[PDB]
């Protein structure tokens, strides 16, 4: 039998305000992680409730930072949680895989800088000042995700291409570049697409905040927020948040050495899962087939499936909460990397859905990796709240065949909701949606850069594969604030027929679509189906469609 609870290990650094040389300790981690884009090192920085002076916590690759109070203002920095782009000469477009949660910031010059691109969530934060999302110098940046946060002053994206904010409060919002989408944000700018490109929804249809580690006195627990319907503003602004607390001893604390056999045994025996920061090779799928299981990763905990197996399979049960995990493909092709529900699953989970939150997938980049379909969502009512599903475009083990990955996300279940959907560079369809009444709020895609020629992406009678395809048989679907970009740098004579493909039906609707050619490297012929202007020139001007059909 598996023993629950226990020590969190050497990769969880726990601070309190009396800890000697905090600034030195977080600086040493940053120096190691700053340019460590593909290394296997992992860190979670955890701060006990209290007030911390004279701190500038710079956050590098694979570093999470968080407070351990029940509320964000319980753990306050007089100081900053900083991401900048110094290591990449002011270019922030590779600032991936890091996170900040459950802290209050009093930034030293009045504005906190969080200049990130994909897979860098900012959750349950209170910024007592402004929030600058751009690197110093206003260089390139491609984020981003803010949820359940309160920014007292102005959020300034400046150069940020696009952004998603949900269930939050902002004192102001400075500008929009290609696609700034908001749902349930108090203080959001009014709907105005295309100028500025603001897509604004009064509420989020359903959301359930990500579970997180905290301290109840001296005891570690995991808070599990209750879901909200038609959510707006923060969950924590008005007193004790709704939800339940799980004692650490009800978790199997996963550390280096654990096997999928032991992990699966823990779940069968009734334990939840806490993945401590590290890299976990498994030789069989991790299986979660118990209702309400929490599977929570710290410090960008990473699962690698060996032998071509699937990394994670969730059964046909209510309430599973998967959060804060990177799934990294192995060199042997996996048919699937993540499965939510069985094939053909038709039960409903409306009152208590399964969710994936801050679940990131990588294929290649840290060595060759391959997978046919990365995430398959079978279970009805599933919530996908911030995912980055990424076929690597740079790094080691990358190439049109070397890290081939045909399909990113396939949604087969009904009433599935995706909020903050980022999917890039797959050889065929990045996202396919076959289930009914699906909803996507915010989509960011970039197409494969390394397609060798036109013939390599021929899709029957269509040039290229849509970034986002709704199956012809679908009756109801709706999407808001969605963009697909191309950069066919291997062969810039390539044409991509469209970013989006869907049947023309009254129940299948899109709002605020765009496609963009990055510097004239390839062009789009249309935005969706054969509708919308082609892109033209080398000046990276979006082609837009406000309403479809
Ligand atoms: O790297 C691997 C990674 O790649 C990703 O794809 C890359 C993709 O991100 C990249 O796209 C480029 C794109 O970012 C860029 O967008 C620009 C945008 O930067 C620009 O911002 C302006 C700001 O410059 C300006 O700053 C103002 C400042 O000048 C002034 O001095 O002060 C002002 C404040 O006082 C300040 O505001 O501010 C304005 C708003 O006021 C911003 O609009 O805006 C332009 C549009 O105007 C926008 O185009 O454009 C480039 C082309 O020019 C894009 O190339 O492209 C790469 C390929 O070249 C991609 O690789 C993928 O997503 C990842 O998966 C990969 O791993
Ligand atoms: O003390 C509290 C503040 O802490 C800051 O953290 C510091 C962090 O930002 C800093 O990173 C350095 C990078 O900014 C630097 O990147 C270069 C840019 O500075 C530069 O910009 C210039 C611009 O300053 C000038 O006004 O205009 C120029 C023309 O437009 C423009 O070029 O662009 C460069 C590319 O051309 C770019 O490389 O790179 C440095 C070297 O790596 C980084 O050190 O690092 C500090 C030391 O560690 C951090 O303390 C927060 O960012 C603030 O929010 C806090 O207030």
Curated annotation (Swiss-Prot):
Q: What is its main location?
A: secreted
Top-level taxon in the UniProt lineage: Bacteria
Q: What is this protein called?
A: Exo-beta-1,3-glucanase
Relay the pH-dependence remark from the record: Optimum pH is 6. Maintains 70% or more of the maximal activity from pH 6.0 to 9.0.
Q: Which residues form the active site?
A: 446 (proton donor)
For this protein, the record's Gene3D superfamilies field holds: Single-stranded right-handed beta-helix, Pectin lyase-like
Its keywords, alphabetically, are: Carbohydrate metabolism, Glycosidase, Hydrolase, Polysaccharide degradation, Secreted, Signal
Q: Which family does it belong to?
A: Belongs to the glycosyl hydrolase 55 family.
Catalyzed reactions: Successive hydrolysis of beta-D-glucose units from the non-reducing ends of (1->3)-beta-D-glucans, releasing alpha-glucose
| Function statement | Exo-beta-1,3-glucanase that specifically hydrolyzes laminarin and laminarioligosaccharides, producing glucose and laminaribiose as end products.
The record's section on InterPro entries has: Pectin_lyas_fold
Temperature curve summary: Optimum temperature is 50 degrees Celsius. Maintains 70% or more of the maximal activity from 35 to 65 degrees Celsius.
GO CC entries: extracellular region
Induction context: Is up-regulated during growth on biomass, i.e. when the bacterium is grown on cellobiose, xylan, and various pretreated switchgrass samples.
Q: Report the GO molecular function annotations.
A: glucan exo-1,3-beta-glucosidase activity
Q: Which residues bind substrate?
A: 118, 138-140, 161, 390-393, 424-425, 449
Organism of origin is Streptomyces sp. (strain SirexAA-E / ActE)
State its Enzyme Commission number(s).
3.2.1.58
């Amino acid at each position: 039998e598996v023993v629950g609870g226990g020590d969190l290990g050497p990769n969880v650094l726990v601070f309190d305000p009396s800890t000697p040389d905090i600034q030195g300790k977080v600086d040493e981690v940053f120096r190691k992680q700053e340019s460590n884009q593909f290394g296997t090192d992992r860190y979670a920085l955890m701060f006990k409730p209290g007030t911390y002076n004279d701190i500038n916590a710079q956050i590098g690759f694979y570093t999470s930072i968080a407070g351990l109070g029940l509320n964000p203002d319980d753990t306050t920095f007089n100081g900053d949680v900083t991401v900048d782009a110094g290591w990449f000469d002011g270019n922030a477009t590779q600032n991936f895989w890091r996170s900040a949660e459950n802290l209050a910031l009093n930034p030293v010059n009045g504005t906190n800088r969080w200049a990130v691109s994909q897979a860098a969530p900012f959750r349950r934060m209170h910024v007592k000042g402004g929030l600058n999302l751009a690197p110093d110098g206003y260089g390139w940046a491609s984020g981003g995700y803010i949820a359940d946060s309160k920014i007292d002053g102005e959020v300034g994206p400046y150069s940020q291409q696009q952004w998603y904010t949900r269930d939050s409060s902002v004192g102001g919002w400075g500008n929009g570049v290609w696609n700034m989408t908001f749902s349930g944000v108090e203080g959001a700018p009014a709907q105005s697409f295309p100028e500025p490109p603001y897509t604004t929804l009064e509420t989020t249809p359903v959301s359930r905040e990500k579970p997180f580690l905290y301290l109840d006195g001296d005891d570690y627990k995991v808070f599990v927020p209750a879901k909200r319907t038609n959510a707006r503003g923060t969950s924590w602004g008005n007193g004790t948040p709704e939800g339940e607390s799980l004692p650490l001893d009800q978790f199997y604390v996963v550390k280096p050495g654990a096997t999928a056999e032991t992990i699966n045994a823990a779940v069968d025996q009734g334990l939840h899962l806490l993945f401590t920061p590290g890299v976990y090779h498994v030789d069989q799928p991790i299986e979660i087939d118990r209702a309400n299981t929490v599977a929570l990763g710290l410090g960008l905990a990473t699962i690698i499936p060996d032998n071509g197996v699937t990394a994670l399979k969730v059964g046909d049960v209510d309430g599973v909460k998967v959060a804060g995990l990177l799934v990294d493909a192995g060199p042997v092709n996996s048919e699937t990397l993540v499965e939510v529900g069985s094939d053909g699953a038709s039960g409903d989970h409306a009152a208590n859905p399964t969710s994936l939150q801050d679940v990131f997938v990588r294929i290649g980049g840290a060595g060759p990796g391959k997978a046919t379909t990365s995430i398959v969502v079978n279970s009805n009512d599933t919530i996908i709240d911030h995912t980055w599903v990424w076929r690597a475009d740079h790094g080691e083990g990358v190439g049109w065949e070397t890290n081939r990955a045909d399909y990113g996300v396939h949604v087969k279940g009904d009433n599935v909701l995706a909020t903050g959907l980022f999917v890039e560079h797959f050889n065929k369809y990045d996202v396919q949606w076959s289930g009914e009444n699906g909803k996507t709020i915010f989509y960011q895609n970039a197409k494969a850069y390394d397609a060798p020629d036109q013939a390599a992406i021929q899709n029957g009678d269509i040039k290229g594969y849509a970034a986002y395809k709704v199956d012809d048989s679908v009756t109801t679907h709706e999407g808001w604030g969605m963009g697909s970009y191309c950069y066919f740098n291997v062969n810039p004579d390539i044409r991509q027929q469209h970013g989006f493909q869907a049947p023309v039906k009254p129940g299948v609707k899109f709002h605020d679509l765009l496609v963009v050619s990055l510097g004239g490297k390839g062009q789009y012929e249309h935005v969706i189906n054969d509708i919308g202007d082609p892109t033209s020139g080398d000046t990276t001007i979006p082609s837009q469609v406000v309403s479809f059909p």
